[PDB]
Write an enzyme that holds these catalytic residues in place. Structure first.
Site, short mmCIF file in Angstrom:
data_model
loop_
_atom_site.label_atom_id
_atom_site.label_comp_id
_atom_site.label_asym_id
_atom_site.label_seq_id
_atom_site.Cartn_x
_atom_site.Cartn_y
_atom_site.Cartn_z
CG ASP A 304 -26.59 78.48 27.26
OD1 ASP A 304 -25.96 77.58 26.10
OD2 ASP A 304 -25.70 78.54 28.20
CD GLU A 498 -18.15 79.68 26.00
OE1 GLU A 498 -19.10 79.15 26.19
OE2 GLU A 498 -17.85 80.56 26.65
NA NA Z 1 -24.87 76.19 25.29
#
Ligand code: NA
Length: 540
Positions: A304, A498
């Site tokens: 996403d 991340e």
């Molecule tokens: Na994700």
């Protein structure tokens, strides 16, 4: 059209607070909407009491910011406050043998700091969550957890696989098994592993890496009780992915394949305000609901968001995830079939084991027929309109187009690997710090210029398992580039990120609806995994 799994009234009331909150604040001072859905009810107040007070406070049409903030600190405990630090029972500052193969003394000492971050990511669900779970959106869990980090203040499903790979390196096998136990408890309660261990995630899952987590733990510990518990729950999860809206049939010149499909057609509570504005361009309610379902389905894909899921990229609002038969998803279910066949063979169920062996071979041939593109030298997502057709293949270039290399019947194919090595070295995805997730700079985080730990690992691991020397050297070169950039980032900011901006060494990545996040579970795990496999010479 599909089902919709309802969330708890706590979640739906916290969305009211969130919507009030972001209307009240100035535009640039917009808070993270998720910190509102992560609140818990401060004792001894009840929901109805708190909702009554909120209804009294909001009878005027915005709310003064200072008035809102006073309400928050009066009736709620802060986000994450119901998630308490936990000292892992199996953590040790310097483990005996830890990365013993890493010659370069500076690299190894950095890696032991990385390994030290398992303590920061280690936490446990507070006793209130277990005793009165209706007061929290944090779900109760049998064991301590490893969280991704920062705003991701709950355990996540597919993150945990690459976390577990690092925990093995870190020799933290009890913590690793604790994550699998936690995830199996979600399969038992819900029939599938939730996107994450929160109440607003009961409507969807994530890429199905559970069977791989059990396998990698067994392969080291040979804990036959873990396998025996896992098998009924993995059978459930396999059923979940191959039935209902998740199952698609594609007739060739009939193959059963899977797609993502979240059981949600509304704004995501954790991002409620943002999703409502994203959908404000659609005139009818059906169009809003279909779009919200494709947004939530992109969340269930784990990526996403990306141009990968856009019907007309880079237009966010053309998100169309429920129309995509994805390469990597069906890589993971192929793995699932190989994993279950292994675990059934090991546990004395040769009849079940042969069912899944034939399962795996059917999907292997679906892969060649449906996803493979000889001219491309890679596998392609198939977009639905049923029977197959060449123009339905998404010919854009993604790191997930190369995920099948992870699978052993694939990377054992010397001639295939060579076609894949050339296609990948010429794709343009290989960048100074690792593999780009796509070639389109879209402003989304799962797009160029970013590269992502799970996708680095699958390709490096796959290429490194082949017998082809050029693959093996490319694999090591990528891993060292990834490790280097993660080191430079760490020296600059003291944290692991991340995602990386792999276009530049030493630069972390951004994009998307939230700020760059640190910790970071699968990023730490891949760093340790790569160092255990490849080491670092003292001369480098
Ligand atoms: Na994700």
């Amino acid at each position: 059209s599909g089902p919709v799994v309802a969330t708890t009234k706590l979640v739906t009331f916290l969305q009211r607070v969130q919507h009030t909150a972001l209307r009240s604040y100035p535009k640039k001072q917009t808070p993270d909407p998720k910190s509102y859905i992560d609140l818990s009810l401060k004792r001894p107040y009840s929901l109805s009491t708190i909702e009554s007070a909120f209804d009294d406070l909001t009878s005027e049409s915005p709310v003064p910011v200072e008035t809102l903030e006073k309400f928050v600190k009066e009736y709620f405990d802060g986000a994450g406050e119901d998630l308490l630090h936990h000292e892992p029972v199996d953590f040790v500052s310097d483990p005996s043998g830890f990365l013993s193969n890493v010659e370069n003394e500076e690299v190894r000492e950095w890696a032991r700091e990385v390994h030290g971050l398992w303590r920061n990511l280690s936490c446990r669900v507070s006793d209130s969550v277990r005793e009165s779970a209706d007061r929290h959106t944090l779900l109760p869990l049998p064991e301590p957890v490893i969280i991704p980090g920062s705003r991701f203040r709950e355990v996540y499903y597919w993150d945990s696989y690459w976390v577990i790979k690092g925990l093995m390196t870190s020799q933290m096998f009890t913590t690793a098994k604790g994550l699998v136990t936690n995830l199996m408890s979600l399969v038992e309660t819900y029939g599938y592993a939730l996107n994450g261990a929160r109440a607003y995630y009961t409507n969807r899952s994530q890429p199905p890496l559970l069977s791989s987590m059990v396998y990698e733990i067994y392969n080291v510990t040979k804990d036959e009780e873990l396998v025996r518990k896992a098998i009924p729950l993995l059978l459930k999860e396999y059923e979940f992915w191959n039935s209902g809206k998740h199952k698609v049939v594609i007739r060739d010149a009939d193959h059963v394949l899977s797609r993502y499909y979240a059981m949600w057609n509304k704004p995501r509570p954790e991002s409620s305000v943002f999703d409502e504005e994203s959908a404000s361009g659609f005139s009818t309610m059906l169009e809003k609901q279909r779009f919200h379902r494709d947004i939530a389905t992109a969340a269930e894909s784990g990526c996403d968001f990306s141009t990968r899921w856009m019907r007309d990229p880079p237009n966010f609002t053309t998100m169309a995830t429920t129309s995509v038969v994805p390469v990597d998803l069906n890589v993971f279910l192929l793995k699932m079939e190989l994993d279950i066949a292994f675990m059934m063979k090991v546990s004395g169920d040769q009849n079940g084991s042969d069912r899944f062996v034939k399962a795996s071979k059917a999907r292997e041939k679906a892969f060649q027929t449906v996803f493979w593109n000889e001219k491309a030298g890679q596998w392609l997502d198939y977009w639905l309109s049923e029977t197959w057709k060449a123009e339905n293949q998404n010919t854009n270039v993604f790191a997930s187009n190369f995920a099948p290399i992870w699978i052993n019947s694939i990377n054992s194919d010397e001639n295939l690997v060579k076609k894949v090595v050339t296609a990948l070295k010429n794709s343009g995805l290989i960048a100074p710090a690792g593999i780009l997730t796509s070639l389109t700079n879209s402003g989304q985080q799962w797009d160029s210029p970013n590269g992502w730990a799970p996708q680095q690992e699958m390709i490096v691991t796959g290429l490194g398992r082949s017998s082809v020397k050029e693959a093996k050297e490319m694999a090591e070169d990528i891993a060292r580039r990834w490790i280097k950039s993660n080191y430079l980032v760490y020296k600059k900011s003291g944290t692991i990120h991340e995602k990386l901006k792999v276009t530049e060494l030493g630069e972390y990545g951004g994009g998307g609806e939230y700020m760059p996040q640190t910790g970071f579970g699968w990023s730490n795990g891949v760093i340790l995994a790569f160092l255990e496999e490849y080491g670092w010479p003292s001369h480098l």
